[PDB]
Design a protein around this ligand. Structure first.
Ligand code: CL
Ligand code: CL
Lengths: 218, 216
């Protein structure tokens, strides 16, 4: 819809109107930091940092959140792996396959599920190094996730360590689940039932469940 | 097992060891407020304010919580009505009767159910006035419920307006259902008891057998 300019790359940020209330501060915060983060090659590329701000928030009832993008090949859409190559998304798809009974599929994407907004807490990383840009995104990450949590009924974070003390410092009343990361040891993600629990919590808040099968690609 | 003294009535508080971490602060907080509570006649009596601290917490997976004790005849055990007279507990027993298929009973008590700790958020009220002691118990109530929510998997609160307010600061799965005396039969259509067991099953915990609460 609308656009806003910033003094460093990617220069323009196009945003859906639901994000308006935070854009002014986003610009201030990004300008203060961008120079530091663009030194490094990144995942995703700078033109893709903010494409998830084109998504609406008012139709969203669940946020599924990872700490930062894939160390390589980040597309700007959290969790997205267009050629279905990344371990995280393969493990997620398996979980939902067992849950939904859908056995034959070629990919999975959170971004095409009604009511779900997939999110990366930090919006970039130094290529090949997870959590490398935490110190730069800090204030922005808090700002944007606070805004998301005013719309969604449930926040689902993936990674017990990654999200230990970040969720305590979010200052939001929103119902929160911190589950295992897909690559957690001893198959703990495979025994994790957060996808089911989400729908129970949504039902308790007088909201429709998420149909997790909508994420499949054929 | 152990005991602690306090400068106003009931003077001694006996507590199960699972409560040890909070007793020191409980004494500080109770001493700083007890004058205000004891001016009034109370439900329950002061000797019964803290008897629920004799219950263990480690074997508990569900906390069932009401806002404060019965306006009259509080026994110190939340929800307990020994002569099965109180509306709340009669409605709860009906709900579980329909759920479990147990049709003939004389009473119901949460306190004899494995895995359940029944709780009153405020530990007293001025006789006949619900919520009258909220302002006195405030800090203590928050302290004790926070401690309970470190052990239990699910917190079930009864009363939508009573428990609307966030101010607990705990990750625990929380359900805020209708109060048993809610209008238009809303408590009768409330399925929180079933939902609790689903949530528990999802957290790899055994369900609560709600039929254990019946008295014959
Ligand atoms: Cl983890
Ligand atoms: Cl109610």
């Amino acid at each position: 819809m609308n656009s806003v300019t910033v003094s460093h790359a990617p220069y323009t940020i196009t945003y859906h109107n639901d994000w308006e209330p935070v854009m002014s501060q986003l610009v201030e915060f990004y300008n203060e930091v961008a120079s530091w983060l663009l030194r490094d090659e990144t995942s995703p590329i700078p033109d893709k940092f903010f494409i998830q701000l084109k998504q609406p928030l008012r139709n969203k009832r669940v946020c599924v959140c990872g700490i930062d993008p894939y160390p390589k090949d980040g597309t700007g859409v959290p969790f997205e792996s267009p050629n279905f190559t990344k371990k995280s998304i393969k493990e997620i798809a398996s979980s939902i396959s067992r849950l939904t009974g859908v056995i034959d599929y070629k990919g999975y994407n959170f971004n095409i599920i009604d009511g779900v907004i997939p999110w990366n807490y930090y919006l970039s990383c130094k290529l090949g190094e997870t959590k490398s840009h935490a110190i730069y995104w800090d204030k922005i990450s808090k700002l944007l996730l606070q805004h998301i949590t005013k719309h969604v009924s449930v926040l689902y974070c993936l990674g017990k360590t990654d999200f230990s003390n970040i969720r305590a410092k979010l200052e939001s009343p929103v119902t929160t689940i911190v589950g295992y990361h897909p690559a957690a040891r001893d198959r703990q993600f495979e025994k994790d039932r957060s996808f089911e629990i989400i729908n129970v919590l949504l039902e308790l808040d007088n909201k429709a469940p998420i149909n997790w099968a909508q994420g499949f690609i054929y």
